[PDB]
Structures are given as C-alpha cells and as structure tokens.
Write a protein that binds this DNA or RNA. Structure first.
Ligand SMILES: [Mg+2]
Ligand SMILES: [Mg+2]
Ligand SMILES: [Mg+2]
Ligand SMILES: [Mg+2]
Ligand SMILES: [Mg+2]
Ligand SMILES: [Mg+2]
Ligand SMILES: [Mg+2]
Ligand SMILES: [Mg+2]
Ligand SMILES: [Mg+2]
Ligand SMILES: [Mg+2]
Ligand SMILES: [Mg+2]
Ligand SMILES: [Mg+2]
Lengths: 109, 190, 138, 176, 199, 247
RNA sequence: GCGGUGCGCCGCGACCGGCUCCGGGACGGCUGGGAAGGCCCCGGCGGGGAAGGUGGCCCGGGGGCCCCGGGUGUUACAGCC
RNA sequence: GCCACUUUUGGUAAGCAGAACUGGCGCUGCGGGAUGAACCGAACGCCGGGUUAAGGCGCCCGAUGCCGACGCUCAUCAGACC
RNA sequence: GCGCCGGAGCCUCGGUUGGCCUCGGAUAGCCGGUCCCCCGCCGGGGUCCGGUGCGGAGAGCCCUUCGUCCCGGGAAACGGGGCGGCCGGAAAGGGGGCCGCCCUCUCGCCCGUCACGCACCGCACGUUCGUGGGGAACCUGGCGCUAAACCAUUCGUAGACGAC
C-alpha cells in the first residue's frame, strides 16, 4: 500500500562532448551518491512511465492512458554514484530530468 | 615557515577592569568605558591571573603578515588602558605668519570654527567625532587642547583640523601656516 | 579559547582512513600536519597519522615523547581509557548511530509501533500542561 | 625521472666489464632514489656516466637492491644536500626535513623543491642525505618542533566532507 | 518538492554551480535573501568587475545591449543563466524552475531554509582573505532598495524571534511532559534506546 | 580619419525617445521627499495655460546694473480653478518598488469627474461607482471602510489623494475633467489620512497649495509640430545649395 | 505419444557456452634466507652517552600540595640511544 | 603546391622568399586543441559489449559530489596548459 | 445570459507517488536552562549548571494505510468527529489558534483472544497530490446583475495614414 520503486532522474544519454549515444541512459538515483553504494542497484529493472492521449492496454487490469518503456540498470558511471542503464526503446528527450522508477524486484539479497 | 605560537601578555593595572565578550574587549575605569571589536584579526584572547592581572593574546600557526597582528592588539589594548585610566590630551598649536587664526569653539567642544586663515573669508567648520572635546587653552597664546579617551578619535579629530587648515596652490615650503599637532600626551600624569 | 591541545599523550578518535572509528594515542609531532601515533590497546599499530583524520578528545595520559609501545600500553591500561570512552557521551551516540544503522526491518516496525504511542502520550500530556498553564494564567 | 609516488631508496652497485687490460674493475655504489628499480638503474648509469668513464654498454649492474628504513618508527631529522638548475644557472642547496623514513624525506624534498623553486625531478640531482641529530639542525621550521613539551591546538577546522549532506539546515561548526 | 536555499554566507558562482546542476536535474530551487551572498576577493576588485560589466554595452543601441540587472537576486539569476545552457529548451525550462528573491518574501518566510556547506564562505575561504557582500555591491552600483529590504528583514527577524521564543517554551513543556510521564512510557522508551534512537 | 574640426553635438541624448507621449496631461515623476516636521500639504496642483503678458516691476537685487531700475518681463497666465478632491490612494514600499495598497473614493462624485471613466459619455448609461457609492450609507459598508482606512494607517508610507479639475468653470470645449494623484507631504501617516479624509469630497484652491513668490516646476507635453526633418527637429546644419538629393 | 515447424500481440524465468567488468575467501615463493616492531629496561649481567633533561634541588609567579616559566645535571618517582 | 621537428641561405623581420631529411595537408573523416586545411592522438565497411590514446573530470559538459597529499601565491591590470 | 454557493459522467494537458509551520547568527567559538542579581516595555546583560565531533542531532523530526469482527489488559476520560462569537495576516496578506453547542463515542492509538473479507491459482505500467489544470453541453435550486468598447459624426490642444 505504498511505494515499491526507488526514485531516479534521467540525467542524460551516455554522451561524449560532441557526440551522444542514445542507446544508454544515464540515471541519477536519489540517495546513492557513491560507487560503494551503487552496487545494490546493478541489474535492476528500471522504467520510464508516461501518459498519452489515446488508451493503451494494461496487463492485469483495464485499458488506461499510462505507458512505459522498460529497461535494466547495467553498470555504474563515474564516482558520484551516477549509473548507466539500457532500455528497450531509446528514451525520448522529453524525459531529461523526469522521474524514472528504479524497481527492486530483480533482487540479489 | 609558520610559527607554532606567538604570544604576548599585557599587564592590567589595579584601577582598571578589562573583560571579554569573545574577541572584542571592553575596558571600565575611572574616566569611562571604552570597547573595541577585534573580530577581523583571528587570535585567541585569554584573560589570565585572578584579580585579573594579565591579558594574554596568542596566535597559533601564523605567517609573518599575520604574526604582525599579535602585538598590535597589545598596542591597541594598552593604548585603551592608557585612555581609560589617564585619558588623552593632544595640544595642537596654531602657527601663522601674518594673519592670525581665530579658533572659536562651538557646542562645548564639538565644533571648531576656524577663521581668518591666510586672510580669507571662508569659515572652516570642523566637527569633532563623538567623544572628544576641543578647547582653547590658557597659559598659551594659540593652542587647541583635544581631550578624549581613544586615540583614534582624538588624533583623527586633530588630523581633520590639520587637514582643514591647509595652504593650497602655493609654496608650502614658504607658507608655513595652519594648526599643527605639537604635544601629544596625557590628561592625568601617572 | 581552546581546550583540546595536540600534545604528547592525548588520545584522539579517528574520523576516517584505514583505522576509522578507533582511538589512538598521539606520541610525537612530525610536521604541521602529521604525527607519530600508536593505539596499543585497540590494535592500531605504531604509525604516522595526519591531523585532519583524527579528532582529539579530552583524555591525556602521560608518557614521554619517545616511549615505546610497551610503555604506551602501560599508561593506557593504567588510565583505563577503554572504559572511560565507552562511558562518555561521545561513544554512546556513536554506538546509537551504529544501532540504528544495524536496525533490521522487523525491529524497524517494532520501533515504529513503539514510538507512535510514545509520542501520543507525550502529545496529550503536553496539551494538558498547556491548558493548565492557561487556567493558571487566568 | 618523474617523482611518481613515494620514492624508494636503492643501493645500487656497478662496474665495467672485465677487459684484457685489467682483469677486474673496482665496484661503485650509490644511494639513489627512484620509484622502482628500472628507473633506478637508469639514474645510476646517469650519475656514473657523469662521474666516471662508464656507460650502459661498457659497464654492468652488479646488485640493484632496496635499502629499507632501519628505524621507521622514530621521527628523525634529515639534512639533504642538493644541486638543481634554475631558469638561469644552477645552485647548490641544503634543506632540512623531518620524517620517519629517509625515502619519505627525499620524496618530501622533491615535493617542496618543485613547490617553491619550480625545480623538476630531472633537474634536481641529489648528492648527500644524512640523519642529523637535533642539535645540528640549522633550519628554523624544523628546529621549532624540537620541544619535549610540544603543545598546539587545531584552531580553524575547515569542513572536510562537504558534499555528503549537500543541502543541510545546519551551519557547520569549525571549532573543535 | 522545492529546495529553499538561504543566500547568506554563500559564494556567488560557487552556489550557482550547485544550483545550476540541481535545477537541470529537475528540482525547483528558491534561493532567498540574495543580498547576503558573498563574493570572494575584496570589494573594490568586485565592483570594478561589475563596472566593467556595465561599460560593456552595445554601441549602436544599448536597448538591445546586455541588460545589466542591478538587483542582487537578478545578478545571481544572471550568473545561474551563465552556467545553464539557456539558448535551448532544457535550459529555458531550468530557468523557469529557478526562482530567486531579494530578502525573504512571505511565501518562504514561513518555511525553513537550507544551506549548502560546499558553497559557504566559512568553509571555502581562508579566514584572513577579503570577501565582498553582493547586496552592498548592488546598492553601490545602482540597485535602489537596500534600505527598504533592510527594514523589512528587520521586521521579519523580529517576528521570527517571537516564533522562536514560543517554540522554545513549547519544547520546554515537552521535556517537562517527558519527565512527568517517563514512569509510564519507560517501556516505550527503552525499546527505542536499544535500537539507538535515544542515547 | 578623425573629425577635422571638433564641434559639440547637436541635440541631447537625455531626451532620446522623441516620440508622441503616451499621456496627454503631464505626470509628476517625483514629488518632494516628505519630512514629518512640516504640516500636511498637497505637493502639486493642476491648471490650464491661457496666454502671455508683460509685467513691469522694480528689481531690488543689490549689486546688479539693474538695481532699483524697472524691467519688463514676460509672464504666463495659468487659469487655475479650485480642484475637487475625490479619493485617496495609499502605497506600501516593497523591495520591488512602491505598490498601491488600497484606493478609496468618496461617496458623491461630480459628473465632470465621472466623464473620465468613459470613452463615450453619450452612449453610456452612466453606471460608474453606483454599486460603490452604496458602501457609504450602510453600516456594514462603512465598517468595511473604517477597516481599510485603519489598514492604510498601518501599512502605507506615502499617501496621495485623487483630485480632479472643475471643468464647468473653464471656457474650454471639453467637459471631461482631469484626475490626478497629488502626494500629501507633511506629518505622519495618521495625520496624513486624517487631513485627506476630512478634506475628502470637497474643494481645495490654489493658495492652500502654492504660495506667492515661490519657485515651482511645470510639467506638460510640448506643442506638437508633426513629423519633421533633421534641420527643424535636431537643428543640424543645412548642407549647401549645390546638393543633388536635397539639402 | 514422437519428430519437425511455429507462438496473434506483450512479457517473465531457468540452466549452458562465449566475451567482459568487478567482488569475496585461501595457499605459497623471494629479500639483509625481509627491514622494523610485539612479549619475557622501568628480557638478563656489567659498561657508557646526551637531551627535544624525567626526577630531585634552586630561582621566579599563578595559586591552593598542584600548575607554569627559567637554571642545574645523567636515570631518581619518566624515558631514549 | 603548401605546412611542421631539426639543419640552413637572403632580410632587422614577416602568416616573406629559397633549399636538405622525414612526416603531414592537398586526396582525410574521427576524439582532443572552445573556434580552426597542417598541431596531439588516431586513419574509417554497418552494428552490440568491454577498454584506451591525446585531452580531461565546479557548471555549460560525460567524468574527482576523492573527508586526495605537500607547498607557493593577493593582483585598485591576478592566474590558468605544444 | 452572466457571475457565486450547493450533482453523475465526456474531451484534452500532463507531471507526480507522505509531510517537515520559519530564530538570529558566530566559526580562535557556539547551543540550552536557571534565575538567586541588576535595568527597560516579557525582553537584555552578569553569575552559575548542563551539553559541544553538535543528540534540544536534517547522520535529524512528525505521520505511518490491509479492513472488519468478538472479548481482555495498558493509554484516554479533560479526548475524537460535526454550529455559532473572539482575535492572529500586507513584501507576493493566515483554509491558524481560542470560548462554549443539542449531537454522539469508548470506535480511533499499543499489546493480546477470535475468525472472516474472490485464497482470482509466481509475472508489467500497482499504491497518491486527484473533487488536478484547461473545454463543452446535459443539470437542479437559491441569493444577485442587466454594461461598455470600436466604427460612423464632431472637435483640432493632435495629425502623412492610422494614432491622440
Ligand atoms: Mg605660483
Ligand atoms: Mg577631436
Ligand atoms: Mg550636381
Ligand atoms: Mg618558404
Ligand atoms: Mg595520401
Ligand atoms: Mg588527417
Ligand atoms: Mg585555443
Ligand atoms: Mg600524431
Ligand atoms: Mg611527435
Ligand atoms: Mg563501442
Ligand atoms: Mg572540457
Ligand atoms: Mg499514476
């Protein structure tokens, strides 16, 4: 009856300075800011959730307007606990600075 | 290098009372109460001895440009003690060749009107900054006694009238006129 | 003014580094920013330590500036530091921090169910004190 | 040589190859300072080419080993004689340091020579490092640690660990 | 959901660097009391840099020129805009997320202000160096409202002092309540002390 | 190369958007700074320009070559009927400036002042302030009005009163009067609002505002002269006769 | 039931292999057959040495026997080499 | 034809003119040098994963949000990368 | 034919997934109490007692959501929920506090006794702020309002034309 996903912000794509590579998202996960702490989140299921105009299906429920783009959390990125991720479809750049959920359920505990 | 410790003590006489509110100092004695805020100077101020005999200022880990501030605090504090126990008296004399300088004191020490300097009609009104008193003395012809507690106010009010009586656009090596500081000293001799 | 002084024989809690969370006894001073140190009754081997990882505390045990680890252990266990440290308020809040870090899920639930009523009783005691202060004010 | 990391002390010996002129050459020994033995043997051939008529080819190394610090748990004073090249002309120096290890004092020597004089490690060549008793010390910044009753606080504890609470509500305390 | 930062004691660009990245990450940041921002270096160098910024001006029509904003809040807004990529939609969305005020207005006087120790002058300057107040520089260079903001800040400091006294006497009542009721909350207290919330 | 002979610049850049002004009557950009020692006084008035006339007077200035001689001097006559006060406006000082707090009008407002709220007085059915003027003759209404006069006493710093001309006394064609905020400089906010509301809805003549032999400042739009060239507007030098594309 | 081929769309898991980035245990070699350090001076027996000089003694002052400053000198009620 | 390390001629000198060796540009993208024919790295079929070079890691802008080490430095014209 | 107060749905824009209701400020110094001492219209200082790697801690605080059913203990009784009057707000105004009221409760909280609630058969956008912002007509009542602007004409303080 509460939240079952960690909060993350789509900081950008995996990018050089004059080149960006849209196949890999960069996720800043709230609370973890160091590579010793990012190890819990490797291989987690992450998801970008958004609404739309016309209805789509929903598995185990009624058709509604919310939609997703699923993905995994591949490996860490830099010393500040920033992490990489790969999604099934590459993210639209609408999502720069929007709340990507990072689930718990591919669990290793 | 950085010197690991530099300290000096200042002996505090029996009639005067210094105390500390952090880094600022306050001094109470016979003539009045005089405070000063040292919060720009980053030292340690211990008040040691019971019957309050010594003010020990010490600075840890200083370069020489900030170890220079160690005994300048001692100089300001013992100048403060001198100004509270004994007070300060700057007797500055009027010097003129032809036209006499007419000094008239208004609002009991607080304003000085200087007239007839080099013959000109412009009256010079100089205000003493608050806490010092100017007075035309007796037993001397043309003298101005500035009495106060703190030397910054006394000597600054003296320097205001010495910068007021100035000869401009002429040869200052021939025109030796104006009021100049003559005898720095003390109201009550020890 | 200051009250904790780096000198020969002060113990110091260590903030971080390899020996994070232990006491050491400062033996001698090498530089402006480094010191020969030894915690012999806590397994900190004789070594140098920078000053900016060690938080000097208010326990001074007396031994000379060149003394060996034998005599540092003698002075340590004669002053009996390891009980004074466990008895002081510093390590009590260190150990309380470590307890709520160690806190599991089930006892986090138990602490929630406890502190809910432990605040409810306080809150109505506070408001009955407030109405008592009002009736004494009028 | 670049002074990468802490330097190590290498006792290194060498000699010319045996020739039909003389059956055996004399053996030559240096205390040198280098990050590892490869650059150590390079600096050995540098100084022995600078002193004797010996080179990489006409000579050979005999034993390049490390000297460990013979008492590394006792703080010691080190006098270090130097010879470095400025922008205009070279200069001899005597600098004093205070350290646990000889190699640590020579590392600190390279560090503050590069700090104060912008002298780089290829320009700085060592010549004599010795452990000096506390009365023979000439330098004031080292001599003012020579007190059995040494005592000083840590006055302005600037805040390490800034970005762990980044947005907090407390102003940090710098008095401890 | 909104950071409220205080501005007193913070360095100008060293605060703007955290604020710029934090706003690009989607936060809503309100940096309040921006006449208390410090700038390192002494006051005369800092106002010479700002007067140089005033002299830099479009020659043929200064109406199109660099709009030198004289208010302290808008000096800080211009330096955050200098750190943000404001020519594009994500930088302009960032500048829409940022709100910056002079003094502490009534939407945010009743809230608690954050501080950034990584930008704070008591941390990132040596104590013997000179610094410069942005409010006094802005008044010095053509901002007109130092006096009215100072009187309004004196008023809110008085009203917050009244609030703080009442909060103190409430928490005194709280601790007297705890000492009156500890005999019958002792079984609830010690289970918190064994889990390290209360020693 | 440089300019051959240096000459000063034609015109002034201080008055630079030389446009038709947006407002017909000139407005006061700054009143005199009030000090609480003075009695309360209006710091402006509003009158209309009539014409030009000589005077003859004996000048008593010592040291001139016209001392106790007798000049003539050109004068201007501004016909200046007593203005009718209609409402008071309060202002609070803000870090963004000085914003208006609470405007409060009078009960009875003259029709020549009512005309100002209408771009067409003919076709309108003249309904202005009719729901507002009922706030004076009921008890809940004047309790609301004493409430916001009490609020203006507490929170305002400068207080300026609306006053309009009394156009039915002038020989002009128009009837629509001119309204103006005049700042009441004088005592405190309390004494200022007391004076303002007790002289609300009634008149005030010239002599209560200005005194004789007093330097004043005159504000207004100039006499419009149309779209005009650089010679008649900026007074640049006419190029010589031989010029091909006009001189 | 067996074998092949596929699922209308959206998904998940399992093990195996390849390629990688780490993490965690544990064992051994060499060296000055590591250097120092640990425990059995207040490791054992005699011998010395000085100081960043402990006791003690003296001088001084802050006190109420403690602390501080200076001097003397060689283990004393600390130690070091 | 042009440029560049070093050698070198004329000229005070030149983003000047003239040679030698070798590499480049021209014919050549790509990362870096903000910008850029020639500099540093590196030469290219279309892609996924890992890793680097040169250069970097407050923010623009990926990466120091290390509890980085030792010093020097106050500029009313600071300094900041072939 | 419009505005406020008092229903079920439809189109569209989307972001979100507990709140933190506040001293001032120093940083070689702070925070909290007591007041026994002294002044000012409760505040401020002195003495004293506590803490000071801050625990009267943003490393923090508050709330904590499976629901109902019986019965028992601890807590509550002065409390919970729901109508009139008093104040508290102006920098960009507070959905706060207080006196009763007819109502009704031992239900709310913490430990236990008792079972029941599609146990939807391992599987994703679940769980909120949401009576969300904006747009249409279906709607039923009540207390209220029936205006200006622009053209055209005129003026000529204005004017290339507009504009004024
Ligand atoms: Mg002359
Ligand atoms: Mg000229
Ligand atoms: Mg012609
Ligand atoms: Mg050429
Ligand atoms: Mg080719
Ligand atoms: Mg190429
Ligand atoms: Mg460049
Ligand atoms: Mg290359
Ligand atoms: Mg090369
Ligand atoms: Mg690749
Ligand atoms: Mg860059
Ligand atoms: Mg949702």
């Amino acid at each position: 009856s509460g939240r079952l996903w960690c909060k993350a912000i789509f900081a950008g794509y995996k990018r050089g300075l004059r080149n960006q590579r849209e196949h890999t998202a960069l996720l800043k996960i709230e609370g973890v800011y160091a590579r010793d702490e990012t190890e819990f989140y490797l291989g987690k299921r992450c998801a970008y959730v958004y609404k739309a105009k016309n209805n789509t299906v929903t598995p185990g429920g009624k058709p509604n307007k919310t939609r997703v783009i699923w993905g995994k959390v591949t490996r860490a990125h830099g010393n500040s606990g920033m992490v990489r991720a790969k999604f099934r479809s590459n993210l639209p750049a609408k999502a720069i600075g929007h709340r990507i959920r990072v689930m718990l359920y591919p669990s290793r505990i | 290098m950085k010197t690991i410790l530099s300290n000096q003590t200042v002996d505090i006489p029996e009639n005067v009372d210094i105390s500390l509110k952090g880094r600022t100092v306050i001094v109470k004695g016979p003539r009045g109460t005089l405070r000063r805020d040292f919060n720009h100077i980053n030292v340690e101020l211990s008040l040691l001895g019971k019957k309050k005999k010594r003010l020990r200022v010490d600075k840890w880990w200083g370069n020489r440009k900030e170890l220079a501030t160690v005994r300048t605090i001692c100089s300001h504090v013992q100048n403060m003690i001198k100004g509270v126990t004994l007070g300060f008296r700057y007797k500055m004399r009027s010097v003129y060749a032809h036209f006499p300088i007419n000094v008239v004191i208004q609002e009991n020490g607080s304003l000085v009107e200087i007239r007839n300097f080099l013959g000109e009609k412009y009256i010079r009104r100089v205000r003493m900054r608050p806490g010092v008193a100017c007075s035309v003395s007796q037993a001397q012809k043309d003298e101005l006694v500035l009495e106060g507690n703190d030397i910054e106010l006394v000597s600054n009010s003296a320097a205001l009238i010495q910068q007021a009586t100035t000869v401009k656009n002429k040869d200052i090596r021939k025109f030796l006129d104006g009021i100049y500081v003559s005898e720095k000293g003390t109201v009550q001799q020890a | 003014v200051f009250r904790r002084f780096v000198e020969v024989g002060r113990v110091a809690y260590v903030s971080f580094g390899p020996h994070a969370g232990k006491l050491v006894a400062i033996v001698d001073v090498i530089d402006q920013n480094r010191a020969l140190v030894d915690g012999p009754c806590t397994r900190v081997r004789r070594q140098a330590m920078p000053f900016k990882c060690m938080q000097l505390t208010d326990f001074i045990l007396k031994f000379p500036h060149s003394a060996r680890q034998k005599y540092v252990r003698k002075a340590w266990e004669k002053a009996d530091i390891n009980t004074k440290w466990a008895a002081t308020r510093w390590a009590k809040k260190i150990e309380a921090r470590e307890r709520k870090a160690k806190m599991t899920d089930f006892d986090r639930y138990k602490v929630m169910k406890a502190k809910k009523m432990r605040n409810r009783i306080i809150k109505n005691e506070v408001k009955k004190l407030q109405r008592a202060a009002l009736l004494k004010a009028s | 040589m670049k002074a990468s990391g802490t330097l190590r002390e290498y006792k290194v010996v060498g000699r010319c190859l045996p020739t039909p002129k003389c059956r055996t050459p004399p053996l030559y020994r240096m205390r040198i300072f280098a990050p590892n033995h490869v650059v150590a043997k390079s600096r050995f051939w540098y100084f022995v080419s600078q002193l004797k008529k010996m080179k990489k080819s006409s000579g050979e190394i005999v034993y390049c080993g490390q000297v460990f610090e013979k008492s590394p748990l006792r703080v010691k004073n080190f006098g270090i004689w130097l010879r470095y090249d400025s922008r205009s002309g070279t200069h001899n120096m005597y600098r004093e340091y205070r350290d646990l290890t000889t190699a640590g004092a020579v590392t600190q020597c390279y560090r503050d020579m590069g700090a104060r004089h912008r002298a780089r490690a290829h320009s700085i060549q060592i010549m004599k490092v010795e452990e000096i008793a506390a009365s023979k010390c000439r330098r004031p910044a080292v001599k003012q640690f020579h007190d059995s009753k040494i005592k000083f606080p840590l006055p302005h504890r600037v805040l390490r660990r800034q970005h762990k609470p980044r947005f907090t509500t407390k102003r940090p305390n710098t008095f401890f | 959901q909104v950071l409220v930062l205080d501005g007193r004691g913070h360095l100008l660009g060293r605060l703007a660097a955290i604020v710029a990245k934090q706003v690009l990450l989607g936060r809503k940041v309100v940096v309040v009391r921006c006449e208390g921002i410090n700038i390192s270096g002494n006051f005369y160098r800092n106002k010479l840099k700002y007067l140089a910024f005033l002299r830099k001006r479009m020659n043929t029509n200064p109406s199109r020129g660099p709009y030198h904003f004289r208010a302290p809040s808008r000096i800080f807004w211009r330096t955050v805009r200098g750190m943000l990529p404001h020519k594009t939609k994500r930088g302009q969305a960032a500048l829409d997320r940022l709100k910056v005020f002079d003094g502490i207005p009534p939407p945010y006087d009743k809230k608690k202000r954050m501080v950034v120790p990584a930008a704070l002058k008591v941390v990132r300057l040596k104590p013997t160096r000179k610094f410069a107040y942005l409010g006094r520089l802005a008044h010095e260079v053509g901002w007109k409202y130092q006096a009215v903001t100072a009187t309004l800040e004196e008023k809110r400091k008085e009203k917050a002092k009244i609030h703080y006294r009442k909060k103190k006497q409430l928490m005194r009542l709280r601790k007297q309540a705890e000492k009156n009721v500890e005999k019958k909350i002792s079984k609830f207290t010690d289970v918190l002390k064994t889990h390290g919330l209360l020693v | 190369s440089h300019r051959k002979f240096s000459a000063p610049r034609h015109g002034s850049l201080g008055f630079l958007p030389r446009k038709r002004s947006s407002r017909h009557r000139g407005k006061v950009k700054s009143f005199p700074k009030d000090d609480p020692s003075k009695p309360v006084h209006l710091t402006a008035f509003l009158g209309y320009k009539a014409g030009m006339t000589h005077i003859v007077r004996e000048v008593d200035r010592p040291g001139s070559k016209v001392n106790k001689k007798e000049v003539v001097e050109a004068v201007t006559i501004v016909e200046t009927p007593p203005m009718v006060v209609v409402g008071i406006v309060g202002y609070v000082e803000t870090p963004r400036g000085l914003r208006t707090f609470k405007t409060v009008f009078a009960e009875h407002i003259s029709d020549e002042c009512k005309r100002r709220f209408y771009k067409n007085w003919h076709k309108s059915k003249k309904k202005a302030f009719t729901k507002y003027c009922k706030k004076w003759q009921d008890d809940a209404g004047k309790r609301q009005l004493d409430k916001d006069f009490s609020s203006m006493k507490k929170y305002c710093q400068v207080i300026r009163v609306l006053a309009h001309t009394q156009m039915r006394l002038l020989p002009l064609r128009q009837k629509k009067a001119h309204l103006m905020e005049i700042q009441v400089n004088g005592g405190t906010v309390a004494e200022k609002l007391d004076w303002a509301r007790e002289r609300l809805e009634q008149q005030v003549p010239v002599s209560q505002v200005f005194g004789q032999d007093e330097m004043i400042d005159v504000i207004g739009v100039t006499k419009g002269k149309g779209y005009k060239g650089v010679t008649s507007r900026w007074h640049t030098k006419k190029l010589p006769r031989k010029t091909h594309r006009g001189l």
